Design an enzyme around this catalytic site. Structure first.
Site, PDB file in Angstrom:
ATOM      1  N   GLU A   1       0.956 -12.963   3.175  1.00  0.00           N
ATOM      2  CA  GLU A   1       0.028 -13.017   2.072  1.00  0.00           C
ATOM      3  C   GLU A   1       0.542 -13.945   0.975  1.00  0.00           C
ATOM      4  O   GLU A   1      -0.172 -14.826   0.494  1.00  0.00           O
ATOM      5  CB  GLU A   1      -0.166 -11.609   1.534  1.00  0.00           C
ATOM      6  CG  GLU A   1      -1.524 -11.306   1.050  1.00  0.00           C
ATOM      7  CD  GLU A   1      -1.736  -9.820   0.947  1.00  0.00           C
ATOM      8  OE1 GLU A   1      -1.185  -9.201  -0.007  1.00  0.00           O
ATOM      9  OE2 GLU A   1      -2.438  -9.275   1.834  1.00  0.00           O
TER      10      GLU A   1
ATOM     11  N   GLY B   1      -3.049  -5.054  14.351  1.00  0.00           N
ATOM     12  CA  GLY B   1      -2.669  -6.336  14.906  1.00  0.00           C
ATOM     13  C   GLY B   1      -1.483  -6.918  14.170  1.00  0.00           C
ATOM     14  O   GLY B   1      -1.296  -6.694  12.965  1.00  0.00           O
TER      15      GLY B   1
ATOM     16  N   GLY C   1       0.814  -1.202   0.000  1.00  0.00           N
ATOM     17  CA  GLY C   1       0.000   0.000   0.000  1.00  0.00           C
ATOM     18  C   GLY C   1       0.846   1.250   0.000  1.00  0.00           C
ATOM     19  O   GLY C   1       0.601   2.171  -0.778  1.00  0.00           O
ATOM     20  N   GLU C   2       1.856   1.274   0.867  1.00  0.00           N
ATOM     21  CA  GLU C   2       2.762   2.415   0.950  1.00  0.00           C
ATOM     22  C   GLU C   2       3.413   2.762  -0.411  1.00  0.00           C
ATOM     23  O   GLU C   2       3.700   3.935  -0.671  1.00  0.00           O
ATOM     24  CB  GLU C   2       3.862   2.142   1.995  1.00  0.00           C
ATOM     25  CG  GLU C   2       4.442   3.399   2.631  1.00  0.00           C
ATOM     26  CD  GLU C   2       5.612   3.113   3.571  1.00  0.00           C
ATOM     27  OE1 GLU C   2       6.692   2.715   3.082  1.00  0.00           O
ATOM     28  OE2 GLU C   2       5.459   3.282   4.803  1.00  0.00           O
ATOM     29  N   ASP C   3       3.660   1.756  -1.266  1.00  0.00           N
ATOM     30  CA  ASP C   3       4.275   2.005  -2.579  1.00  0.00           C
ATOM     31  C   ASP C   3       3.246   2.374  -3.664  1.00  0.00           C
ATOM     32  O   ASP C   3       3.456   3.293  -4.414  1.00  0.00           O
ATOM     33  CB  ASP C   3       5.069   0.782  -3.089  1.00  0.00           C
ATOM     34  CG  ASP C   3       6.310   0.464  -2.260  1.00  0.00           C
ATOM     35  OD1 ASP C   3       6.855   1.354  -1.576  1.00  0.00           O
ATOM     36  OD2 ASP C   3       6.761  -0.702  -2.313  1.00  0.00           O
TER      37      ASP C   3
END
Lengths: 167, 171
Positions: A76, A42, A11-13
């Site tokens: 994942e 978590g 997400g950050e990228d």
């Protein structure tokens, strides 16, 4: 199954730009795609995500500079590759402005990632590297920043359309 | 006219990503769009481009951080605004991760651009400043990051479609 494609990404990228354009391109083609947009916390990866992988016919992995810097991303991928071995789960890796061999060998940014894992996550590292190396030895697309990105995406989404829709 | 939209952008900022995704989105809506992809050289802006603007029903301007750092972009913009006064040329400004007021007032990165123009391009600066200021006062879209870009684009191209279709139907 529920989705044609599970989108795994950092997400950050790439959440708001490349992966979003990819997500939207897939849908336009009638390829049902799961792209996680929920707030999550978590230490352990959310069960809902592990289930979504299992209910997807395939995964698209957006490998980006800091993908391995996320434990959730790695977990994942381990799950995605399990589904690849055990189920009929197809896997399409995208090397988004990163050297595919850096992902295979965990060099460069990916190497720095695992370096940080040595002291507190040492036992998960093996399954992580294996899943990383396995995914990266699959035929995918190496994308550079010297090319028109919508054409890159069209090429990717057409190839996925051919493999998932044409039967 | 030949095109529905002329796409003005700073290649170095947005050629291969945002403006490309915008370009493709416009096409999907049947909006015939001119997006320059030719190799060009020479100090003066290409006549094919000025002609292209005149043969377009409107222009979409992708204002980005270094737009004013290109004299070609600025000369482009002047032509666009001239067609706006003299022709019936519609103009849709997008402020792509830049403050609309920086464009309007030539502050921030846009101010820095003009500093460099002072010594060798001083005489063109006024019409350039005017074209930026006018263009930025047209109603457009200010786009930030931390927002889903395909949705930003869908919203822009939907609005442009409705506006160009209503212009055409009133004529």
């Amino acid at each position: 199954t529920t989705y044609d494609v599970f989108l795994s990404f950092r997400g950050e990228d790439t959440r708001y730009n490349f992966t979003d354009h990819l997500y939207s391109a897939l849908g336009r083609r009638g390829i049902r795609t799961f792209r996680d947009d929920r707030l999550r916390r978590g230490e352990a990866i959310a069960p809902e995500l592990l289930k979504a992988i299992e209910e997807s016919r395939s995964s698209v992995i957006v490998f980006s500079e800091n993908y391995a810097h996320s434990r959730w991303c790695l977990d994942e991928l381990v799950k995605i590759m399990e589904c690849q071995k055990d189920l009929g789960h197809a896997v399409f890796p995208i090397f988004y402005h990163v050297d595919p061999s850096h992902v295979r060998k965990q060099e460069g940014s990916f190497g720095e990632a695992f370096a940080g894992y040595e002291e507190n996550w040492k036992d998960k590292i093996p399954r992580w590297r294996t899943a990383l190396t396995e995914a990266a030895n699959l035929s995918g697309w190496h994308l550079l920043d010297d090319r028109y990105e919508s054409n890159q995406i069209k090429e990717i989404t057409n190839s996925i359309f051919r493999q998932l829709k044409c039967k």
